[PDB]
Amino acid sequence: TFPTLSPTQIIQYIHLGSFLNAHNVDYIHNNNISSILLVGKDQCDILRLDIVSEEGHQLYDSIPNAIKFIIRSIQRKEGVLIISGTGVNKAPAIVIAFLMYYQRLSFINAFNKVQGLYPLIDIESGFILQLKLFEKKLEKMNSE
Template sequence: MEMTLTICLLTCGILYKRRIMYILLSCSLPHNVDTHPKFHGLSLFVVENKPLPKEVQMVKRYLHVYCLDSEHFNILRHLNECLEFMDEGISAGDLVLVHCNAGMSRSGSVMIAFLMRQLSLTYLDASVYAKKMRPLISPNPGFVEQLKLFEQMGNVVDDGNDLYRRYCLNLFSEMIISTQNFSSLDEILWAADPVVNHTPVSLFKCKACRRPLFKHSNLIKHNVENSTVKMNNHVSEMSLQARLVLLDR
């Protein structure tokens, strides 16, 4: 039995050469989505904490990106993959469905970022544009902050950008401080030891054992007096670690 679909049409007219974008408002998809005439040539993009059922994944192209609707979740780290998938679907002439649980925060954030990059819009202009098509779009405060950072980086995600690297560090520190769960540091992705080659580079080593620790590129410039890094008062509470957090992944 086919389930009811609630779809909001988001079209950008000739700017997209008459390509049509949709935002799916709920989890409702027909069980025969792979053969359903409405979804011929469908690219389904799911930005949620869990994938859709396998029978729904039987479409032309499918991508699931793990994402929590939390203001502490870094959605920017997945944005390049999201936008590339959408670009490929549009280039192939596919119908692209962008889906999350409520069609408000996660999928809305991706759509706003897409408009920002495609049309060279500011966050504010892209947000207004998207909400005209779907008033319910409402990224959470953390996603709004990240989209504004996306704008500051020129509507691209630049892992080497100091603003982005500082944001990642603050996000990480706030998570640790708010939970007071310093043991969880062991579960965080740590940077591999820096590769030593013949290319001239500033390499910092342990004074005692001379083990390579980090390169100059791993440093984040900041004003010490007005530093936004909030880990200073908590470093002493942490157990000593032999590796560094990889900020430019």
């Protein structure tokens, strides 16, 4: 029951959390987090992604804006905290998309890496499907 009160560090500068543990202000302070990515307090850098359902392509469409806000934070050498309401579905899908790009992982390998750091992962299948669409998009953009 205590783990729910803290975000999880995924790789350096990248933290995965919920509306709940976003309130862990000391965690934020001690990990130098200055950005928050809301998937779904006016003292931080904030970006909201407007994802309201698992159908269609709202998650896919929001991928390049998310990666950008995230890399902007890595560039400052500061933490970004990525959160959805329960922290279990939408926020982890975004973190997966990011690592696919940033560490050239396939969908499944980026999934497994996050899963092994964050056992509560439970992403709706429409989101998994959109992540696979992103996988294909990256393949084409990245061909010799």
